[PDB]
């Protein structure tokens, strides 16, 4: 009987405007996208099979380097971390500013995408990494060259850091759906890849273990979740390609939420998509920084 059409009319008019703002913003971005961003990355002289060989060859600064795992494929650009834990780490995945889209299909994830590195402000070389996914074929060929360890690093929006170290890491080729395998964990972020979400029990925790999983993209379902509904796929819901199970305890290639904290009503599908690592900050916190690097294991 009382004041009602008052409030209901207010919100609708407010949303009308919000839509006006969003249309403006999206319309402006489209114009900016008529031309691309650019970089100029002069190539270091020293090269090798990978970053470890490069550092042993004298390349002691973290920047973009050219590597050639094997005479088979052509040399390609990669970012080498020559300072973290004795350097020699070949970055295969990097998150730090949400500047690159990770919600891509099988082929892009197969070929690799994003920016390996950008200019060091006033320099001719690119000493800063960009956001990128090295490429499933490439990551696979690198891990099968010999024993390989994996170093996963992350940072929250407050500046806290934690690492997940895996002494053994392998990724099979395409014919094997880039199956993943890791072991020999250690660190301070919690073993989410092997043991699963440290905040779940029995069956629930087990379905979030990545170790042994196949790789899935929203257009290629190889997850450990059986359903008949085409919309019930881990990759379509949690954003991006990953070794999803049912579904995850870690979502390194998830959507980049600014601010960290996010909730079910912000998420496109209500699920916990986002740069998540449950064993440390929970399911609704998106890391500010997240990266995956490898190095030959000695």
């Amino acid at each position: 009987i009382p004041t009602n059409l008052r409030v209901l009319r207010s919100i609708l008019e407010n949303l009308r405007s919000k839509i006006q703002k969003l249309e403006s913003d999206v319309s402006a971005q489209m114009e900016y996208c008529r031309t691309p961003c650019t970089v100029s990355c002069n190539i270091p002289v020293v090269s090798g099979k990978e970053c470890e060989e490069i550092i042993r060859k004298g390349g002691e600064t973290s920047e973009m380097y050219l590597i050639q795992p094997d005479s088979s494929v052509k040399p390609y650009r990669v970012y080498c971390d020559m300072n973290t834990e004795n350097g020699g780490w070949t970055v295969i995945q990097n998150r730090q500013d949400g500047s690159v889209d990770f919600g891509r299909k099988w082929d892009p994830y197969k070929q690799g995408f994003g920016n390996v590195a950008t200019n060091t402000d006033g320099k001719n070389y690119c000493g800063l990494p960009g956001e990128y996914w090295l490429g499933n074929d490439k990551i696979s060929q690198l891990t099968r060259m010999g024993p390989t360890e994996l170093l996963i690093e992350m940072e929250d929006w407050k500046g806290d850091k934690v690492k997940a170290h895996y002494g053994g890491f392998t990724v099979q080729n395409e014919a094997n759906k880039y199956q993943i395998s890791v072991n020999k964990y250690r660190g301070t972020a919690g073993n989410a890849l092997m043991d699963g979400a440290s905040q779940l029990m029995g069956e629930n925790r087990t379905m979030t273990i990545h170790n042994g999983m196949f790789f899935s993209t929203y257009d290629r379902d190889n997850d450990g979740w059986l359903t008949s509904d085409p919309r019930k796929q881990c990759s379509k819901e949690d954003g991006g390609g990953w070794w999803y199970n049912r579904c995850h305890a870690a979502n390194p290639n998830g959507r980049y939420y600014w601010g960290g904290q996010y909730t079910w009503d912000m998420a496109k599908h209500g699920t916990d998509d986002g740069v998540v690592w449950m064993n440390w900050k929970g399911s609704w916190y998106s890391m500010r920084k997240m990266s995956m690097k490898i190095r030959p294991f000695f």
Partner: peptide, 4 residues
């Protein structure tokens, strides 16, 4: 997260 999981999918019970």
């Amino acid at each position: 997260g999981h999918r019970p």
